């Protein structure tokens, strides 16, 4: 993985030594070169993972997450250069450096062979994200960080150090072969919660989800793209690595949290039918889609893991495109109110076509990989219990509705009279929409690369 | 009830509106033209039978039981004109009613396709922007203190001046764009 | 379909309806002929004249504009305002 980390770090002199007008073009060009380089991670085999060194390895789970992570950086640089054109040049380079450092943390979070190195990179990703949201966010306690680190990261730290002292190693490749059955006790119960709850908050879990529809609203566009596209999937990646050690206790301890997700994807979806903020609607949709990833990881069948990694990749693409569409409207009406600007197909036909495609992939229109992930998760949960299909299907009613209501509220009807600064679609914005949607459509032609270690 | 200029319907206006909606629901009940024509003359005669009534409280009483008669004899689906609200063709072309200001944001190579049109539009914009301050100072002295009482706008007064708040009424889109 | 109406055509159709009406003598009807003051008509007859206009041209005039059309010149002007003629 050293052939990807070193160009990522050479993007730091490539963004600081460049000229005063060249720090978007150079960074976009060379990050697209690294994203083209990222396809060599697809050297995968049906038995053995692509094990590079003692520190780095990349199986078919981390590989689509890595390709999406290295693809997300040029798209964030295309997204965030408009509203930073009035920003200072040194703070502009600071923003690009925070994005490059966050990519640097992510690409060796996903390829950490050893679990405490995964933990350090996992909790190192939060610092550039928090700098981006607090500094280049728009509006104005802080108790969410404290409640996160009490129930989350340090129980995970003590848990991984305990596994280190018991097993002798936190190598995932060794723990594939030295995994022991974890019996019913109270020590193993709090051990299981200490291993799981940090990723539970990072998904988010329903009831622990309220940090996200505010962190998306207080973010810039690149912060929202990297939150909903990659950083929410660190929880799913960590769960798919940590549920190896946590058997067979999960077979009776997944019962509460699955409830919180199986009802949660009912509630938050319905919350998406009662939103006034477009960006909060996309945020609660992200919660409702990650609930199925939580369910599919906790029931731990092969069809569920295939559906969950397909849903992670497809939801990263779809939610990033929806946040970029919300950015394109926020950079015209200067207000995130969804009922404010209406009828925008009468003015911007191609942008309304991108809205149509994004809403079709949001409600899992087949043969998209959204529907492939959604469908495989529904198959595995029907195998889990034959009643959950109702709770699936009711969800698949509501996930249509707010996907099209958001399409009907903003893009249809009579246009707003007192808004006359609706410019035509810039070429950068439609380029951003097409670089979100055309990979998402092309993966429908060959989905087996985004179906995880056990296709 | 809810009026732009006035604040209430008068008793005479209530009788006119109840008579007109009564004939519309009657024609909804009376599909054929001659049958509706006979019953319309009957309903006209029944409204004429209580025309020269001078007591206002007794007239309000008769109007109350007339509203009960109207509610008792109404059609579930009344006839609605297509461009009228509630009709089948209502607000159909509002997806084609593009506002005028987007014409200010075209490329010059698609403004050069219509040279005379934009060359004629620029003097409309000039007339608007040199009429605006005159009609603003015409508003601020003709409106009484405490805001305008009614929603009625005054006309122009000087030979060479335009009425106030006129641009989006004149440049509003057509019924068939 | 939907032929382009002109003010001369709209005026001739409005006066053609009102000359088919038994309380209007066709030699006294003019464009400035008020209904309550030049024809001496009832308010009920004015409601029925506006309803005949509505049955004629194929659209509905609201009551806030139906209570204020008191001569055929204002009727032709309101139909011109709500049909965009002489383009």
């Amino acid at each position: 993985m050293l052939k990807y980390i070193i160009p990522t770090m050479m993007l730091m002199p490539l963004t600081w030594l460049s000229k005063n007008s060249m720090i978007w073009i150079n960074t976009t060009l060379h990050s697209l070169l690294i994203s083209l380089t990222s396809l060599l991670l697809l050297n995968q085999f049906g038995d053995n993972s692509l094990n590079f060194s003692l520190t780095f390895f990349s199986d078919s789970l981390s590989t689509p997450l890595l390709i999406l992570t290295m693809w997300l950086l040029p798209l964030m640089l295309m997204a965030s250069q408009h509203h930073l054109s009035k920003e200072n040049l040194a703070r502009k380079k600071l923003f690009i450096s925070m994005l490059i450092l966050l990519q640097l943390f992510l690409i060796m979070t996903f390829t950490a062979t050893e679990l405490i190195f995964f933990y350090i990179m996992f909790e190192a990703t939060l610092v550039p994200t928090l700098i981006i949201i607090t500094r280049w966010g728009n509006q104005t306690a802080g108790l969410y960080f404290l409640f996160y680190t009490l129930a989350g990261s340090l129980p995970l730290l003590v848990a991984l150090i305990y596994i280190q002292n018991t097993m002798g190693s936190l190598n995932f490749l060794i723990l594939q072969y030295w995994v022991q059955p974890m019996p019913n006790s109270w020590s193993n119960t709090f051990m299981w919660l200490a291993c799981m709850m940090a990723f539970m908050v990072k998904m988010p879990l329903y009831g622990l989800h309220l940090w996200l529809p505010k962190a998306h609203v207080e973010a810039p566009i690149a912060g929202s793209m990297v939150l909903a596209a990659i950083l929410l999937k660190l929880g799913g990646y960590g769960m798919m690595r940590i549920t190896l050690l946590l058997n067979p206790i999960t077979d009776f301890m997944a019962y509460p949290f699955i409830m919180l997700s199986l009802w949660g994807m009912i509630m938050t979806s319905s919350i998406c039918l009662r939103q006034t903020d477009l960006k909060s609607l996309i945020a609660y949709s992200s919660v409702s889609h990650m609930a199925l990833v939580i369910v599919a990881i906790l029931i731990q069948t092969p069809w569920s893991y295939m559906g969950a990694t397909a849903l992670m990749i497809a939801h990263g693409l779809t939610s990033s495109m929806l946040f970029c569409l919300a950015n394109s409207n926020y950079e015209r009406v200067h207000s995130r109110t969804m009922i404010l600007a209406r009828g925008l197909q009468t003015l911007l036909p191609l942008m309304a076509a991108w809205w149509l495609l994004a809403s079709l992939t949001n409600l899992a229109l087949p043969p998209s990989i959204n529907l492939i992930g959604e469908l495989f998760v529904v198959m595995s949960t029907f195998s889990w219990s034959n009643i959950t299909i109702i709770l699936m299907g009711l969800n698949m009613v509501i996930t249509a509705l707010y996907s099209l209501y958001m399409l009907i509220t903003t893009q249809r009807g009579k246009h707003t009279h007192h808004i006359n600064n609706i410019l035509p679609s810039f070429t950068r914005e439609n380029a951003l929409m097409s670089l979100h949607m055309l990979p998402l459509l092309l993966l429908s032609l060959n989905p087996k690369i985004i179906l995880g270690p056990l296709y | 009830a809810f009026l732009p200029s006035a604040a209430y319907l008068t008793h005479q206006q209530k009788v006119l509106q109840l008579y007109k909606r009564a004939l519309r629901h009657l024609e909804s009940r009376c599909v054929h033209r001659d049958k509706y024509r006979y019953f319309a003359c009957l309903l006209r005669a029944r409204f004429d039978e209580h025309k020269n009534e001078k007591d206002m409280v007794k007239a309000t009483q008769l109007l109350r039981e007339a509203e009960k008669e109207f509610w008792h004899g109404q059609h579930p689906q009344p006839y609605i004109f297509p461009e009228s609200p509630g009709g089948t063709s209502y607000e159909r072309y509002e997806c084609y009613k593009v506002p005028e200001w987007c014409l200010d944001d075209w490329h010059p190579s698609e403004k050069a396709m219509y040279p005379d049109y934009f060359a004629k539009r620029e003097q409309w914009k000039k007339l608007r922007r040199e009429s605006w301050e005159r009609e603003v100072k015409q508003l601020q002295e003709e409106t009484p203190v405490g805001g305008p009482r009614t929603e009625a706008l005054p006309p122009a007064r000087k030979q060479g001046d335009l009425p106030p708040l006129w641009w989006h009424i004149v440049t509003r889109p057509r019924e068939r764009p | 379909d939907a032929p382009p109406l002109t003010l001369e055509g709209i005026k001739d159709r409005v006066l053609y309806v009102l000359k088919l009406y038994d309380k209007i003598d066709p030699e006294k009807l003019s464009v400035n002929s008020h209904f309550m003051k030049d024809l001496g008509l009832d308010s009920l007859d004015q409601v029925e004249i506006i309803m005949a206009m509505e049955d004629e041209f194929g659209f509905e005039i609201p009551d806030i504009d139906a209570e204020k059309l008191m001569c055929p010149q204002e009727i032709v002007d309101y139909i011109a305002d709500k049909k965009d003629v002489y383009e």
Binding site: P349, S425, T427 | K97, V98, P99, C102, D105, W106, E110 | -
Partner: peptide
């Protein structure tokens, strides 16, 4: 004749 100008947004971009 008597053609009417189609009021439309910018389709060039």
């Amino acid at each position: 004749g008597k053609r009417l100008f189609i009021i439309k947004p910018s389709g060039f971009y």
